[PDB]
User: Which sequence fits this backbone?
């Protein structure tokens, strides 16, 4: 005779513990030293759609993203173009510092200025300038909407405005701006708040809305397209006060990078990552203390670390976030060259088990190549994941294509790394939404409605895991096939 | 084929398309040198962004009298090439 | 539940499941059979894409 | 609520042993038979330059 | 000189000022280790790349 | 590309914003002269374009 189906759930009680392993049982080191491909997360119960899953993630103590995606600070992945779009799509980009300090601050500057509420110090022009001059400025700045001030300074008296349609089909490039510019400009009086100035802008159906004071002097400007950028990207990572996209940047820990940071700070930097292969050093600790009291509004991510003791040191220094990973990265050899590193899964768990107790979010950096690694990285305690090789080869990553491949590189060229090449991947305007949607479905399969709920259900032993034998990793992927040809 | 058709066709002012076998600039020059007035490009332009279809082994696009289209042809795959706004 | 009372003579195989808790749920619903497997299949990537699955033997 | 960062180092005490394995725990044969590629050395604290390292 | 310099940097990453200090810190349990799963050995090196081209 | 757009896509005054947004997706452009009968050769009553419906919430 069999058991009654009515008792199926009642019978689950008779078993000691839940099917599978808790995270503790999965990560004890004595029974050890495992990575993302060595385990799976077991599925739970689905009682909600995948569109309902929230992927809000803490990047630092104070900064939260709508998606746990962070582009890595490497000169083949993250410059201005990458940082802008990672931010628009719910994440953030960390601009690389393999360039002079002026060049890096300019990149930060272009990210902070891509989208504005109130454009502070808008690019203006004097009445003496010509059409030939206004065309040159369009090629330099990317926009052609220039308020015309009497002295050519951002704070001069407003005389008119000139835009794309005022110079589009002008045959004489020697004309003065004063002759073709629109002189009766609709403006808003200074002191008007954003919601009020947005309404004036909408009602005119005009491109710009210069803001003037009582003297008639320019102070700021609004753009109709910033209202469009907001509507097109409702998850963009941007400051609530200024409406500008969040931007990050990496620096070293030597003396020269103290002045470097200041110039980045000046350019609007929201978060700095201390770029080091082994972060638990006196040089980096001093840097963290120095940044907290010199630029207190700047959020500091220290790293890289892979041990609990390292994390304690850099948290005690005042870190607002931790970057986890040493050698687990694509094209990284520190483990072969220095004999020093750690399997990434084990590093994430043991750092985050300690760091999370202090509310210090952690970036899982290195070894991430697909959605499953992201899920596992977060399952083990990470708050965000950093991506390098995944995003190299996309259109937004900096470089030129060429055995479509892009060269990928901390090697002698930039030895603890190598130079390589990755394949073309298209634009992240499609690729990031794909990872985002993919993480939603995986959270559904597991039975969690949010990453915050994901973290709680793991620590409580609700979510379960299974060790991965080398043979089961072959099952989890493609196997026993002659050939096989994700998205698009 | 191009030479002997165009040597006769051009006498009647009938332009000729050199069709097939073109994969690079050198073939275009030679096609014209032999009498062709224009050159037709198939595989060269497949795999560009303007070409129809979707991308997907080992960035490729399926290509092609083939049994699938309908055997005097085959089905294959060509590499991604970007937009013809730069390539042409 | 809807198939057991609407077409009672029809046998229902639910799935896929890979855990004891999943099986208990779908049996309690009235399943007449269970389909076991998540990602272990030839040409299947749910484990790489969803990080979710289980070795088939286990 | 979270823990104070001031207590980060004080809190390291509450853990039984240091993160990772000692060499003894790494080399017991019954738990075995490993080579160079089967283990890594975990990093510590840097408070000196690399030129200062003596390899006598 | 490359291997020499390389060993210096690795001793720095570990936190030891000399090989003699290296030996003492291991035997005392200060230096820590981690077992290597066949999957982590792939992470420690190059992986997920079309091609890759140390010194000079 | 045109010089003189022969028989331009028009809209009647009864159409709504929801209708003009559907047409932009179908035809790819939003510049619609408004004719009294909705036919291309009707009497011109006005014109509606992208900026006339961009931020309309109703
Ligand atoms: N705030 C304004 N007040 C008055 N006239 C304006 C204002 N903004 C633009 N104009 C005038 O209207 C025309 C441009 O409007 P807008 O600047 O809105 O078009 P654009 O900037 O040309 O963008 P598009 O490329 O879609 O035309 C120009 O003739 C310019 O002088
Ligand atoms: N001028 C301007 N206004 C913005 C921008 N972003 C948001 N707003 C305004 O802020 C208000 C709320 O925007 P909302 O989409 O709800 O949230 P947000 O995108 O995080 O600011 C709206 O009235 C917007 O018009 C921007 O980039 N530029
Ligand atoms: N016109 C102008 N735009 C700026 C400036 N700084 C940043 N921007 C941004 O660059 C974008 C310009 O878009 P758009 O107005 O359509 O370009 P334009 O029509 O040529 O002015 C907007 O999102 C602005 O917020 C500036 O100084 N002048
Ligand atoms: N409305 C409109 N006018 C055009 C177009 N193409 C050319 N024209 C006009 O025809 C005239 C000659 O243009 P041209 O520079 O010689 O180039 P072409 O007409 O295309 O051979 C100009 O006045 C153009 O403005 C078009 O596509 N639309
Ligand atoms: N507006 C409109 N454009 C057409 C039509 N048929 C062809 N077109 C072409 O589509 C393009 C539309 O231009 P666009 O600047 O996109 O206008 P808008 O988007 O409607 O503001 C032009 O080259 C037109 O000549 C039509 O029926 N209506
Ligand atoms: N050991 C080492 N790690 C690097 C180097 N360059 C970058 N990395 C790490 O590798 C990460 C990217 O690895 P990926 O995501 O491609 O697997 C970076 O975010 C950074 O943490 C290097 O030269 N040596
Ligand atoms: N994760 C996943 N499993 C699939 C998919 N399609 C089929 N399967 C599973 O794979 C089984 C066949 O695998 P095979 O017997 O070829 O190894 C099917 O019976 C089904 O359970 C899919 O698209 N994704």
Assistant:
């Amino acid at each position: 005779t069999y058991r009654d189906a009515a008792t199926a759930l009642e019978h689950l009680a008779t078993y000691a513990e839940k099917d599978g392993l808790s995270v503790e049982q999965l990560m004890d080191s004595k029974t050890g030293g495992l990575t993302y491909n060595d385990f799976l997360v077991l599925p739970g119960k689905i009682d909600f759609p995948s569109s309902e899953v929230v992927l809000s993630s803490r990047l630092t103590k104070k900064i939260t993203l709508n998606a746990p995606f962070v582009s890595s600070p490497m000169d083949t992945v993250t410059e201005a173009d990458m940082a802008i779009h990672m931010a628009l799509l719910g994440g953030i980009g960390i601009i690389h510092h393999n360039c002079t300090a002026e060049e890096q601050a300019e990149m930060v500057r272009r990210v902070k200025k891509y989208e504005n509420g109130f454009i502070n110090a808008p690019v203006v022009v004097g009445p003496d300038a010509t059409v030939a001059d206004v065309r040159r400025m369009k090629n330099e700045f990317g926009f052609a909407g220039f308020p015309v001030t009497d002295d050519g300074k951002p704070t001069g008296k407003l005389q008119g405005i000139i835009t794309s349609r005022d110079i589009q089909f002008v045959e004489d490039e020697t004309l003065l701006v004063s002759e073709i510019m629109t002189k009766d400009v609709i403006t808003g009086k200074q002191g008007i708040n954003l919601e009020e100035a947005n309404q004036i802008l909408k009602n005119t159906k005009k491109g710009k809305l210069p803001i003037v004071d009582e003297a008639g002097c320019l102070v700021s400007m609004l753009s109709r397209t910033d209202l469009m950028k907001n509507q097109s990207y409702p998850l963009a990572s941007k400051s609530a006060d200024t409406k500008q996209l969040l931007c990050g940047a990496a620096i070293g820990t030597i003396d020269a990078d103290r002045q470097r940071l200041a110039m980045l700070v000046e350019a609007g930097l929201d978060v700095v990552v201390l770029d080091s292969s082994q972060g638990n050093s006196v040089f980096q600790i001093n840097m963290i203390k120095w940044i907290k009291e010199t630029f207190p509004d700047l959020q500091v991510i220290a790293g890289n670390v892979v041990t609990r003791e390292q994390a304690a040191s850099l948290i005690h220094a005042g870190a607002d976030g931790l970057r986890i990973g040493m050698g687990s990265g694509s094209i990284c050899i520190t483990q072969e060259v220095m004999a020093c590193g750690r399997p990434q899964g084990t590093a994430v768990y043991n750092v985050t088990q300690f760091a999370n107790q202090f509310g210090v979010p952690c970036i899982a950096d290195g070894g991430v190549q697909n959605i499953g690694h992201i899920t596992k990285a977060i399952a083990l305690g990470a708050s965000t994941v950093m991506m390098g090789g995944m995003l190299a080869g996309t259109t937004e990553s900096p470089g030129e294509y060429f055995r479509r491949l892009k060269t990928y590189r901390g090697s002698i060229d930039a030895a603890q790394g190598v130079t390589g090449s990755v394949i073309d991947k298209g634009s992240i305007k499609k690729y990031i939404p794909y990872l985002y949607n993919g993480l939603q479905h995986s959270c559904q399969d597991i039975g969690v409605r949010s990453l915050v709920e994901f973290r709680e259900k793991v620590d409580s032993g609700s979510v379960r895991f299974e060790f991965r034998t080398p043979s089961a990793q072959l099952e989890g992927g493609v196997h026993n096939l002659h050939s096989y040809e994700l998205f698009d | 084929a191009v030479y002997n058709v165009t040597q006769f066709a051009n006498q009647f002012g009938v332009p000729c398309i050199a069709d097939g076998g073109v994969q690079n600039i050198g073939h275009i020059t030679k096609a014209i040198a032999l009498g062709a007035s224009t050159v037709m490009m198939g595989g060269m332009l497949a795999g560009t962004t303007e070409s129809p279809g979707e991308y997907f082994r080992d960035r490729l696009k399926t290509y092609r009298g083939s049994i699938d289209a309908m055997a005097q042809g085959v089905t294959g795959s060509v590499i991604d090439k970007g937009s013809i706004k730069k390539y042409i």
User: Anything to note?
Assistant: The helical segments of chain B are 2-9, 25-33, 84-87.
